[PDB]
Amino acid sequence: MAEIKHYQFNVVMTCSGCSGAVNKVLTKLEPDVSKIDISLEKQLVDVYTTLPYDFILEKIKKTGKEVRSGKQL
């Protein structure tokens, strides 16, 4: 089992690429993740999933940008 928790991350999404790259990573997590939202303006990324915090932090930064911080909700 897992329940869907709401994670929020701040990733340094300044180039018109990394947004797409994270999104592409999301495309693999889709059949597990419940919901996603992504914001360049406010340099933040909200993901509603089962998968643990650390996994997502890695997954995000993996794409190239740094992950500044995040939290769970």
Q: Report the binding-site residues for Cu(+).
A: 15, 18
In 33-73, beta strands by DSSP E: 35-39, 44-49, 67-72
Q: Which is nearer to Cu ion, 18 or 26 (CB)?
A: 18
Binding site for Cu ion (CB under 5 A): 14-15, 18, 65
Residue ranges of the annotated binding site are 15, 18
Q: Which is nearer to Cu ion, 43 or 50 (CB)?
A: 43
The rounded distance, in Å, linking the Cα atoms of 16 and 56 is 21
Take residue 2 and report the two structure tokens written for it: 């897992």
State the minimum distance, in angstroms, from the CB of residue 11 to Cu ion: 8
